[PDB]
Symmetry: C2
Subunit: 375 residues, 2 copies
C-alpha cells in the first residue's frame, strides 16, 4: 500500500449496456469498468458499483479524481487514500465511494503487477487458495413463483455453497410458502440466505421473521434500513438469526457504529462500493475483533469486481461466503477470460499478478453504451 | 399542495459557477450548481444543489439523467416526483444524489408556487412568519491569522445579525480558547456565539476544549464528532450542558429518525439543498418538533436560490432555529440575482412573490460559470 506507483498517464472507462441473458432470466445492469495506465506503462483494472441513473455521474467523478491525482509523481495506494480523505472533507455517499473504489482497485492491481504478486498475496502472507461462494437468485424482470423455483433447482444442481433468495412477496402466507418450497428443493442442509431488501412495513417484517425461523435461514439480510441502527439491534436481539447489513452504505464511521451498537453479525458492503480495499480490509479486521464476518456484496460484473472480492475473501480470517450472480457469468466471459473458476461450492482464484484480469477491450467497447479514454 | 399538477417538463438548464472572490476578497466562493426547469406550459422553476468539491459535474449529470427520466411523466407533481425518486433509488442514497434530487424538487416547488400564484411559504403552511431570524457564519478558505478573523468578526458585529458562528479549533487548546475569548470581547455577552468544531480528529482535544469553553456561553456546539458516530454524539451531549448540532453532512429521513430515537442532538442542520428535498426537510422538522429538537438549516450554497428555499422553509415551521447566512456571499449573489429577501439586522425578510421569488440575469450567471448544460 506504500508501493510507489509513479505518475498516472491514461484513463479508460466503459459503461456496458444492459444485456439479456441467453436463457432470458435477467438483464445485466450497466457495469462501470475502468483501466488506468501509469507513466511506466503498467495497467490496472477497477470497477465501480453502478447505480441506476447515476452511472455517467459516477464515471464523471472518476474522471475528475483521475485528473487531480494523475500528476502526483509518487502516487501510492496510501497517498491516493489520504488525498481522497482530504478532498472529501467528510462528505460521503455511495456514488462517490463507488468512484473512489474503482480507482483504488486499479491501484491495487497495478501494485500487484509491480511486486509480481496476486492481490491476495499482497494482503496476507498465506492466502486461502479456494473461496467459498454462494449464488444469488434474482431478476430485474417480473417472475412468478415457479419461474424462481425452476432457477433455484438449476442452482441447486451446481452445488454452490449456498443460495440467496428474496422471499418478501405479496403476503405473509405466500412469502413463507415460497421459503417452504425452496426448502423442498435444497433440503435442510444447504445454506439458504434470505434477502428481505428493506420491507417498508416493520410489522410485516416482524411477522415474517416469527414465521420463518422454522426453516433455519442461514442469514437475514437487510430486514430494516441500514441506517436504522436501533431497529437492527432490536431485530438482531429479538430473533436468533444472523443479521446482514451494509451493501447500501459506505465509510468506516457507519460500520464502526454498527459494531458499537451490536447491530449486525455479518457486514456486506459492496466490494466496489465501500470506498476501496483499504477500508474493506480495515473494517474486516475490526469486525473480526468483534465476532462479525464479512460477506462482500457483488452486484457487479463477474470480472474485475468478482476478482477483487475473491482476493479479499481469501485474505481475511472472518470471510463469509462470497456472492456470485450466475446469470452474469456468461456475459462477463464475453470480454474477460475470468481469473477464477467455480468448482461446486468454491472459487479457485489466480496466482498471477494483481487481479489476473485479461480483457478483450475491442469486445468490451462493442458492449458499451458510454466510454472515456483520456491521457 | 404536493399534488399540484405540473405536467410534462420541456427544458433543463444547469450552471456550475466558477470560484470567484467573495465580498471584500474575504474568501473564494465555492462552485454553485443552480438549475432552471421549464415545464411544457412554460412555467419556470429554479433549484440549487448542495455542491461538493470534485463532484459538481457528477451532480449535474445526475440531475440531467433524472430530468430525462421524469420529463415525459404527463401528470408530474412534487409528490409523484418524490415517489419516483424513492422507487428508482431503491435505498441507495448519499450526499451527491440527495443534492441532485434537492435541486429538482426545489424547482418543482417554485413551479408549484407559480401555478398557485403564491409564495412557497404559503404553500407550506397557512400563516407563515414573514421574517426569519438569521446568524452569520465567519469562515474562509484563504490563509489568514486570528487577527484577520477578528476584524471580520467586528464587521459582522456592526451588522447586528442574530448571531455569529466561528470555527475555533486552532493550533492548540489555549490558542483556540484565546480566540473564543477575544471574539466574546468584540461581540459582548448577549450575542449568540455559535461554535463549529468541524469534526475534530482527536476526541480528547474536543473534550478539553469543551471543558474550557463553557464559560464563554456558546449558543451551540456544531459537529463536535462525526454525525454518523451516534454513540459519540450521545456521549458528548450527555457530558456537556451545551446545545449539540449535527446533520449538515448527512441526508435521508432514516439517519435523522435514528438521531431522534437516540436523543443524540438538540438541533439538526441538514443543508437546505442537500437533504434530498423540501418534503424531507419538512417531515424531519415535524418529527424533531414533537421531540423537542429544533432545525437550523445549513446553507453553504449561493445566497440566491438555496437561501430563498431555506427562508421559506424556516418561516413555515414552528421549531426553526436561526437560519445560516454567509454575508460574504451576499453581494456576489447580487451580481446575478435580485435577491428575494432583505437582511435587516437580525432577520431576513422574505418577499411576497410567487414560489421562491427568483429573478436571475442568466447572461451574468453564464459569464460567472465554468460549466453549463442545456437539455430538452
Ligand atoms: Mg441484499
Ligand atoms: Mg458486540
Ligand atoms: Mg458546520
Amino acid at each position: 500500500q506504500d508501493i510507489s506507483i509513479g505518475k498516472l498517464s491514461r484513463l479508460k472507462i466503459w459503461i456496458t449496456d444492459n444485456h439479456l441473458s441467453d436463457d432470458q432470466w435477467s438483464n445485466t445492469k450497466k457495469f462501470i469498468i475502468i483501466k488506468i495506465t501509469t507513466e511506466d506503462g503498467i495497467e490496472g483494472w477497477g470497477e465501480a458499483f453502478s447505480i441506476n441513473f447515476r452511472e455517467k455521474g459516477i464515471a464523471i467523478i472518476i474522471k475528475e479524481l483521475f485528473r487531480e491525482i494523475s500528476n502526483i509523481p509518487n502516487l501510492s495506494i496510501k497517498s491516493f487514500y489520504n488525498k481522497i480523505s482530504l478532498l472529501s472533507d467528510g462528505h460521503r455517499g455511495l456514488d462517490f465511494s463507488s468512484a473512489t473504489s474503482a480507482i483504488e482497485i486499479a491501484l491495487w492491481d497495478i501494485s500487484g503487477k509491480l511486486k509480481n504478486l496476486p492481490l491476495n498475496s499482497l494482503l496476507t502472507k498465506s492466502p486461502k487458495p479456494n473461496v467459498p461462494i454462494y449464488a444469488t437468485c434474482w431478476s430485474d424482470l417480473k417472475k412468478d413463483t415457479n419461474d424462481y423455483l425452476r432457477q433455484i433447482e438449476k442452482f441447486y444442481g451446481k452445488k454452490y455453497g449456498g443460495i440467496k433468495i428474496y422471499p418478501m412477496l405479496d403476503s405473509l402466507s405466500i412469502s413463507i410458502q415460497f421459503v417452504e418450497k425452496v426448502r423442498e428443493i435444497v433440503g435442510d442442509e444447504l445454506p439458504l440466505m434470505l434477502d428481505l431488501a428493506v420491507p417498508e412495513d416493520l410489522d410485516q417484517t416482524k411477522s415474517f421473521l416469527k414465521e420463518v425461523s422454522s426453516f433455519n435461514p442461514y442469514w437475514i439480510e437487510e430486514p430494516v434500513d441500514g441506517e436504522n441502527i436501533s431497529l437492527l439491534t432490536e431485530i438482531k436481539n429479538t430473533f436468533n438469526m444472523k443479521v446482514v447489513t451494509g451493501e447500501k452504505q459506505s465509510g468506516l464511521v457507519h460500520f464502526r457504529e454498527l459494531i458499537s451498537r451490536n447491530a449486525a453479525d455479518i457486514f456486506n458492503p459492496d466490494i466496489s462500493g465501500m470506498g476501496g480495499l483499504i477500508d474493506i480490509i480495515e473494517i474486516s479486521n475490526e469486525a473480526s475483533n468483534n465476532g462479525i464476518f464479512i460477506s462482500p456484496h457483488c452486484w457487479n460484473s463477474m470480472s474485475v469486481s468478482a476478482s477483487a472480492m475473491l482476493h479479499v475473501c481469501s485474505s481475511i480470517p472472518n470471510s463469509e461466503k462470497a456472492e456470485i450472480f450466475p446469470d452474469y457469468i456468461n456475459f462477463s466471459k464475453k470480454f474477460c477470460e475470468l481469473p477464477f473458476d467455480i468448482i461446486d461450492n468454491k472459487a479457485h482464484i489466480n496466482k498471477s499478478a494483481g487481479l489476473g484480469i485479461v480483457i478483450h477491450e475491442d469486445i468490451l467497447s462493442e458492449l458499451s453504451i458510454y466510454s472515456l479514454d483520456e491521457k
